C-alpha cells in the first residue's frame, strides 16, 4: 500500500503551490489535488496516541483505493475516528487476519467492510 | 571637482541626467533578464534607447590603440563631449543604429559612421 | 553578507519561476476552452456565409448600401486588444501597426474613428490622443454572442446612418502555440463575397430588401464574433509562450546564481578556518 | 504635520516596488502613487542651504494637505522656492506666530494663503 501514497503524497507536493487555482485542467490537476488533500489529511495524527500496525494498513488502504474522494477534507479525521470504532467492534476477523498473517485480507471482504461503514457514516 | 560653480551649470546638469538615466537602465536589467523588452512601460522603452546609446557614445578611440586597431585616435574637447550627449539625451539621435556610437569620439563621426553604413 | 544575498536572491528568483509555472499552465487551460469555442462557433457562420452567398449575388441586384462602396468621407477602426498585459507583443503588434498605417495612409483630424476592445488600447489611444467613439472592457476570458451583440450592433448602426462610409478591424490570427500574425480585414461595405456552390433559390416573403436589410447587420455581428473568438485564443497562446520563456530564463538565473553561491561558501569557510588557528596560534 | 509622512512613503514605496508593469491601476493606488511621487519631489533639497523649521512645516503642511496634488511633479520644486519667495513677503505673521509658540497657526488662515499663493503661481 505504501507505494501509491508515496506516488500521490509527490504529486501533491509538486503541485501543492498552485491549489488556489480551481481554473487548472478539470482532469490530471484537480485529481491529483482533490486525493493529496485528503493524503495529507490523513497523515495527521493526535498527540501521545500511537495506532496499531494493522489499523494504519487499513486506513492507508481505504484512503489509496478511492474509497475517501467523496469524503470531505474537512471530515477525512471523523471519517478515521468513526472508521477505527468500526473495525474494532465488528471487523475482527480482518484485524486478526492482518496481525497472525503480516498480509492483507481478502480485497472482496475488505471492500465489504468499508462500503458498509460507508453506509452508515454521516457526513456535516 | 564635480559642482556645478567649478565645471558649469550646463555640464553639470548633463552629467547628472547622463548618472540618472544610466542608473534607470541599470535597475531594469533584471526586468529585462527575466521577462524582455515586451513588459516594460513605453518611457522605458524610451529610457533603454536612450542609455545604450549613451553607454555605446561613452566609448573612445586612443592615439595609443593605433598600432593594434588603425583607428587613428581622437581627442574630444570637453565642450564637443557636453554639447554631444546633450544632443543625445535631447532625443535628436534617436533614429541611428546603436553601431554608430561605438568608437567615434565627436558626435560628427556618430553621423559620418551612420552615413558610412547607409543610414 | 554575500553568501546571505545570493541565497535572497536565488530565493526571490525560485518564487518568480513559480509564478510563471503556475500562468503557464493557467494560460494552456484557458487555451483548451478558447479552442473549444472557436470548434463550437463554426456551424453558424458558415450557414450563413452560405445564405448570404445565395442572396446577396446571383438572386439579383444591389438592393442594400451595404453592398455597394460610397465615396469615403470617414473611416471607423476596430481594434481588439487584451484588457491585461503580461504577454510577448501580442497588443505591441497590432497595436504598431494600426498606427502605422493611420499615420501612413490617413489621419487628417477629423477623418477617422476608432473602436477600442481592451483596456491596454483604451491607455493607448488616450495616451496618443487617438479620437475614440465606442468603448468596451472588462470581457470574460471566454466572451459570449450576448457580451458583444449591443458593440456590434452599434458599430453595424453608425455605419449604416453614414457616419463613416468604411470600417476596418485589426486582430491577431491564431496558427499555432509560436505564431501570431496581424491580420487586417475590410468589413463593410461587403467589397468581397465568396461564391456558394449549392446554388439554392427561395421563395422570398416579402421580397429581397427586407431580407437583405435583417440579414446583412446579423452577418457583419457574426463576423466580429470570429474575430473576437480568434483574438482570445492568440492572447491566451502567446500568454502561455512567454510565461515558458520566463521560467526558462528563471532556471538560468538560478543556476548561475549557484555557481557563485557555491564560490561565496568555499571563501567564507576558509576565512572562519584561517583565523580560528590564526587566533589559536596568538596563544 | 509629518505624522502621516512615514506612512505616505511606505505606501509609496510598497506600491511603486511593483506598479511599473502590474497595470493595477486602482483609483487608491494612482492616488497614493502621485501623492508620493509629489512628496519624494519635495523632499529634495540642494547643498549648503539649510531652511527655517517654519518654513519647512510650512510645506510639508502644504503637501499633506493635498494642496499641491494638481501641481506637475517637473513644476513641483519651483512651487516650493516660489512658495518660499511669498512667504518672505506676505504671511510673515504666520512664520512669527510659529517661531514664537512652536505651533501651527489657525487652519483657516493658513489654507486661505496657501490659496492665494497657488492661484498667484504659474503653472508650466
Given at each position: 500500500?505504501?507505494?501509491?501514497?508515496?506516488?500521490?503524497?509527490?504529486?501533491?507536493?509538486?503541485?501543492?503551490?498552485?491549489?488556489?487555482?480551481?481554473?487548472?485542467?478539470?482532469?490530471?490537476?484537480?485529481?491529483?489535488?482533490?486525493?493529496?488533500?485528503?493524503?495529507?489529511?490523513?497523515?495527521?495524527?493526535?498527540?501521545?496516541?500511537?495506532?496499531?500496525?494493522?489499523?494504519?494498513?487499513?486506513?492507508?488502504?481505504?484512503?489509496?483505493?478511492?474509497?475517501?474522494?467523496?469524503?470531505?477534507?474537512?471530515?477525512?479525521?471523523?471519517?478515521?475516528?468513526?472508521?477505527?470504532?468500526?473495525?474494532?467492534?465488528?471487523?475482527?476477523?480482518?484485524?486478526?487476519?492482518?496481525?497472525?498473517?503480516?498480509?492483507?485480507?481478502?480485497?472482496?471482504?475488505?471492500?465489504?467492510?468499508?462500503?458498509?461503514?460507508?453506509?452508515?457514516?454521516?457526513?456535516? | 571637482?564635480?559642482?556645478?560653480?567649478?565645471?558649469?551649470?550646463?555640464?553639470?546638469?548633463?552629467?547628472?541626467?547622463?548618472?540618472?538615466?544610466?542608473?534607470?537602465?541599470?535597475?531594469?536589467?533584471?526586468?529585462?533578464?527575466?521577462?524582455?523588452?515586451?513588459?516594460?512601460?513605453?518611457?522605458?522603452?524610451?529610457?533603454?534607447?536612450?542609455?545604450?546609446?549613451?553607454?555605446?557614445?561613452?566609448?573612445?578611440?586612443?592615439?595609443?590603440?593605433?598600432?593594434?586597431?588603425?583607428?587613428?585616435?581622437?581627442?574630444?574637447?570637453?565642450?564637443?563631449?557636453?554639447?554631444?550627449?546633450?544632443?543625445?539625451?535631447?532625443?535628436?539621435?534617436?533614429?541611428?543604429?546603436?553601431?554608430?556610437?561605438?568608437?567615434?569620439?565627436?558626435?560628427?563621426?556618430?553621423?559620418?559612421?551612420?552615413?558610412?553604413?547607409?543610414? | 553578507?554575500?553568501?546571505?544575498?545570493?541565497?535572497?536572491?536565488?530565493?526571490?528568483?525560485?518564487?518568480?519561476?513559480?509564478?510563471?509555472?503556475?500562468?503557464?499552465?493557467?494560460?494552456?487551460?484557458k487555451l483548451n476552452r478558447a479552442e473549444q469555442n472557436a470548434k463550437s462557433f463554426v456551424p453558424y457562420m458558415e450557414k450563413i456565409q452560405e445564405?448570404?452567398?445565395?442572396?446577396?449575388?446571383?438572386?439579383?441586384?444591389?438592393?442594400?448600401?451595404?453592398?455597394?462602396?460610397?465615396?469615403?468621407?470617414?473611416?471607423?477602426?476596430?481594434?481588439?486588444?487584451?484588457?491585461?498585459?503580461?504577454?510577448?507583443?501580442?497588443?505591441?503588434?497590432?497595436?504598431?501597426?494600426?498606427?502605422?498605417?493611420?499615420?501612413?495612409?490617413?489621419?487628417?483630424?477629423?477623418?477617422?474613428?476608432?473602436?477600442?476592445?481592451?483596456?491596454?488600447?483604451?491607455?493607448?489611444?488616450?495616451?496618443?490622443?487617438?479620437?475614440?467613439?465606442?468603448?468596451?472592457?472588462?470581457?470574460?476570458?471566454?466572451?459570449?454572442?450576448?457580451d458583444i451583440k449591443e458593440i456590434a450592433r452599434k458599430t453595424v448602426g453608425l455605419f449604416a446612418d453614414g457616419t463613416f462610409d468604411e470600417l476596418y478591424m485589426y486582430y491577431n490570427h491564431?496558427?499555432?502555440?509560436?505564431?501570431?500574425?496581424?491580420?487586417?480585414?475590410?468589413?463593410?461595405?461587403?467589397?468581397?463575397?465568396?461564391?456558394?456552390?449549392?446554388?439554392?433559390?427561395?421563395?422570398?416573403?416579402?421580397?429581397?430588401?427586407?431580407?437583405?436589410?435583417?440579414?446583412?447587420?446579423?452577418?457583419?455581428?457574426?463576423?466580429?464574433?470570429?474575430?473576437?473568438?480568434?483574438?482570445?485564443?492568440?492572447?491566451?497562446?502567446?500568454?502561455?509562450?512567454?510565461?515558458?520563456?520566463?521560467?526558462?530564463?528563471?532556471?538560468?538565473?538560478?543556476?548561475?546564481?549557484?555557481?557563485?553561491?557555491?564560490?561565496?561558501?568555499?571563501?567564507?569557510?576558509?576565512?572562519?578556518?584561517?583565523?580560528?588557528?590564526?587566533?589559536?596560534?596568538?596563544?
Open positions: 500500500v505504501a507505494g501509491t501514497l508515496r506516488l500521490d503524497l509527490a504529486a501533491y507536493r509538486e503541485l501543492e503551490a498552485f491549489a488556489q487555482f480551481g481554473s487548472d485542467l478539470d482532469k490530471a490537476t484537480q485529481a491529483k489535488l482533490a486525493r493529496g488533500a485528503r493524503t495529507v489529511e490523513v497523515l495527521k495524527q493526535d498527540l501521545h496516541q500511537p495506532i496499531p500496525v494493522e489499523k494504519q494498513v487499513l486506513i492507508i488502504y481505504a484512503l489509496t483505493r478511492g474509497f475517501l474522494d467523496d469524503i470531505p477534507v474537512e471530515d477525512v479525521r471523523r471519517f478515521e475516528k468513526e472508521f477505527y470504532l468500526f473495525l474494532d467492534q465488528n471487523g475482527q476477523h480482518l484485524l486478526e487476519h492482518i496481525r497472525t498473517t503480516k498480509d492483507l485480507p481478502n480485497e472482496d471482504d475488505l471492500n465489504k467492510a468499508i462500503e458498509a461503514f460507508k453506509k452508515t457514516f454521516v457526513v456535516s | 571637482a564635480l559642482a556645478p560653480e567649478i565645471v558649469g551649470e550646463e555640464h553639470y546638469q548633463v552629467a547628472r541626467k547622463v548618472q540618472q538615466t544610466l542608473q534607470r537602465y541599470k535597475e531594469l536589467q533584471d526586468i529585462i533578464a527575466i521577462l524582455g523588452m515586451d513588459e516594460l512601460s513605453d518611457e522605458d522603452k524610451l529610457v533603454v534607447h536612450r542609455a545604450r546609446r549613451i553607454q555605446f557614445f561613452l566609448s573612445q578611440n586612443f592615439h595609443v590603440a593605433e598600432q593594434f586597431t588603425g583607428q587613428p585616435g581622437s581627442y574630444v574637447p570637453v565642450k564637443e563631449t557636453v554639447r554631444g550627449f546633450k544632443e543625445i539625451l535631447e532625443g535628436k539621435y534617436d533614429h541611428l543604429p546603436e553601431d554608430a556610437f561605438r568608437l567615434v569620439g565627436r558626435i560628427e563621426e556618430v553621423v559620418e559612421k551612420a552615413k558610412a553604413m547607409g543610414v | 553578507a554575500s553568501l546571505r544575498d545570493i541565497k535572497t536572491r536565488i530565493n526571490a528568483t525560485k518564487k518568480t519561476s513559480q509564478i510563471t509555472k503556475a500562468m503557464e499552465m493557467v494560460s494552456t487551460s445564405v448570404v452567398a445565395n442572396v446577396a449575388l446571383g438572386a439579383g441586384g444591389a438592393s442594400h448600401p451595404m453592398l455597394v462602396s460610397r465615396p469615403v468621407k470617414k473611416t471607423g477602426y476596430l481594434v481588439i486588444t487584451s484588457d491585461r498585459g503580461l504577454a510577448g507583443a501580442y497588443n505591441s503588434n497590432v497595436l504598431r501597426l494600426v498606427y502605422q498605417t493611420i499615420q501612413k495612409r490617413h489621419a487628417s483630424p477629423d477623418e477617422y474613428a476608432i473602436i477600442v476592445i481592451g483596456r491596454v488600447g483604451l491607455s493607448f489611444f488616450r495616451k496618443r490622443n487617438m479620437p475614440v467613439i465606442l468603448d468596451i472592457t472588462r470581457l470574460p476570458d471566454q466572451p459570449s454572442f450576448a491564431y496558427v499555432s502555440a509560436i505564431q501570431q500574425e496581424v491580420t487586417e480585414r475590410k468589413l463593410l461595405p461587403l467589397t468581397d463575397l465568396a461564391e456558394n456552390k449549392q446554388r439554392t433559390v427561395y421563395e422570398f416573403e416579402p421580397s429581397q430588401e427586407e431580407i437583405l436589410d435583417v440579414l446583412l447587420p446579423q452577418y457583419a455581428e457574426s463576423l466580429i464574433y470570429g474575430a473576437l473568438l480568434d483574438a482570445k485564443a492568440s492572447e491566451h497562446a502567446a500568454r502561455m509562450t512567454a510565461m515558458k520563456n520566463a521560467t526558462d530564463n528563471a532556471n538560468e538565473l538560478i543556476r548561475t546564481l549557484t555557481l557563485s553561491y557555491n564560490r561565496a561558501r568555499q571563501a567564507a569557510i576558509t576565512q572562519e578556518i584561517t583565523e580560528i588557528v590564526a587566533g589559536a596560534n596568538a596563544l
